[PDB]
């Protein structure tokens, strides 16, 4: 953590393999205006002023989210310390004018992204023609900012900066928006290999470095408000045509 000058944040990293959140602190400097926006969020260029521990910001005043038993007591090891080290340029995302964004939802979005990141590794283990990867994402509590009209602290999510032409390959409701095979085959892979317990769609990013994915599950629970359940899964099916990569992976037509 550097001096000076920016704003402090509590930084949360989820680690799927121990199934725990890792709580840290960082300092960051964010541009006043967004460089981009989509249906739900605005994105801002940001630079890291370093990552440190959470010692100064005691947890549990009580009523915790995430609850204490979901939090690692040790945080010495994490991705943030290298990927957001001092001087790193990265992206910060805020929900637009939010009504429906509870605290739990931000953590849901980050966890969802980490799950998708596991699916990417699993896809890559089949050695397809093009490997894929999902970016890290983290929750940040912007503790230096005045709480909202309702007294909630300001939350956001952050992720690495993608350099290149950002493209959306499918949506979370049936749209197939480019001719590329790998993104559609990856979505189908997740459906079949999960035994239809889930699907990853809204495959989008620069080349095969993806971010902002969306998972549908049949019960429609969790995975944020973009989880459209069976309906989302079925929409994907109606517009999906298998391609050579699906064939290479031996997926059912």
* C-alpha–C-alpha distance, residues 200 and 85, integer Å: 30
91 lies in the binding site for ligand ATP (CB under 6 A): yes
Q: For strands 89-95 and 41-52, give the pairing.
A: antiparallel
State the nearest-atom distance from the C-beta of 40 to ligand ATP, in Å: 3
12 within 8 A of 22, measured Cβ to Cβ: yes
The residue assigned the tokens 């059912």 is 252
N-term to C-term CA, the chain = 52
- According to the binding rule CB under 6 A, does residue 98 interact with ligand ATP? no
Of 64 and 237, which CB lies nearer to Zn ion in the complex structure?
237
Total Cβ atoms within 10 A of residue 150: 5
Closest CA relative to residue 44, chosen from 167, 157, 137: 157
Strand partners, 199: 216
Tokens encoding 8 = 């402090």
Of 4-12, 57-65, 89-97, 183-191, the segment contacting Zn ion by CB under 5 A is 183-191
Q: Is 245 left (phi over 0), alpha (psi -120 to 50) or beta?
A: alpha
The verdict on 173 binding ligand ATP (CB under 6 A) reads no
Strand duo 209-210 + 133-134: pairing: parallel
Nearer to Zn ion, 80 or 246 (CB): 246
- Do 130 and 208 touch, CB atoms closer than 8 A? yes
| Calculated CA dihedral for residues 48, 52, 56, 58, nearest 10 degrees | 100
Between 57 and 166, whose beta carbon lies closer to ligand ATP?
166
Known binding-site residues for ATP equal 224-229
Which of Zn ion, ligand ATP, none does residue 87 bind (CB under 5 to 8 Å by kind)? none
- Nearest Cα neighbor of 79 from 67, 64, 90 is 90
Binding at 88: pick from ligand ATP, Zn ion, none (beta carbon under 5-8 Å per type): none
Residue 240 interacts with ligand ATP (CB under 6 A): yes or no? no
Site stretch for ligand ATP (CB under 6 A), options 22-30, 38-46, 61-69, 242-250: 38-46
CB under 6 A: which stretch of 14-22, 32-40, 54-62, 111-119 binds ligand ATP? 32-40
The least CB distance from residue 156 to ligand ATP, in Å, is: 12
Q: Which stretch binds ligand ATP (CB under 6 A): 126-134, 155-163, 184-192, 232-240?
A: 155-163
Q: Which of 29, 103, 124, 166 binds ligand ATP (CB under 6 A)?
A: 166
Site size for ligand ATP (CB under 6 A): 17
From candidates 180, 188, 216, 235, binder to Zn ion by CB under 5 A: 188
3-state secondary structure of 133: strand
List residues binding ligand ATP (CB under 6 A). 36-41, 43, 91, 93, 159-162, 166, 202, 211-212
């Amino acid at each position: 953590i550097s001096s000076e000058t920016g704003e402090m944040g509590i930084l949360w990293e989820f680690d799927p393999i121990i199934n725990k959140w890792i709580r840290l602190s960082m300092k960051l400097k964010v541009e006043r205006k967004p460089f981009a926006e989509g249906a739900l969020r605005e994105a801002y260029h940001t630079v890291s002023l370093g990552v440190g521990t959470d010692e100064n910001y005691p947890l549990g005043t009580t009523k915790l989210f995430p609850p204490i038993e979901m939090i690692s007591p040790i945080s010495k090891n994490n991705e943030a310390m290298t990927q957001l080290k001092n001087g790193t340029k990265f992206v910060l995302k805020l929900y637009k004018k939010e009504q429906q964004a509870s605290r739990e939802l931000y953590f849901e979005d980050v966890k969802m992204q980490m799950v998708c990141r596991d699916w990417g590794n699993k896809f890559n283990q089949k050695k397809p023609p093009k490997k894929i990867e999902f970016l890290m994402s983290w929750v940040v509590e912007l503790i230096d900012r005045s709480p909202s009209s309702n007294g909630q602290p300001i939350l956001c999510s952050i992720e690495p900066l993608l350099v290149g032409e950002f493209k959306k390959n499918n949506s979370n409701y049936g749209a197939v928006l480019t001719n590329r095979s790998t993104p559609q085959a990856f979505s189908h892979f997740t459906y079949e290999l999960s035994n239809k317990q889930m699907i990853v769609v809204a495959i989008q990013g620069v080349d095969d470095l993806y971010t902002d994915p969306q998972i549908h599950t049949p019960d429609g629970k969790g995975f944020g408000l973009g989880n459209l359940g069976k309906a989302g899964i079925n929409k994907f099916i109606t517009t999906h045509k298998c391609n050579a990569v699906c064939a290479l992976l031996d997926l059912d037509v």
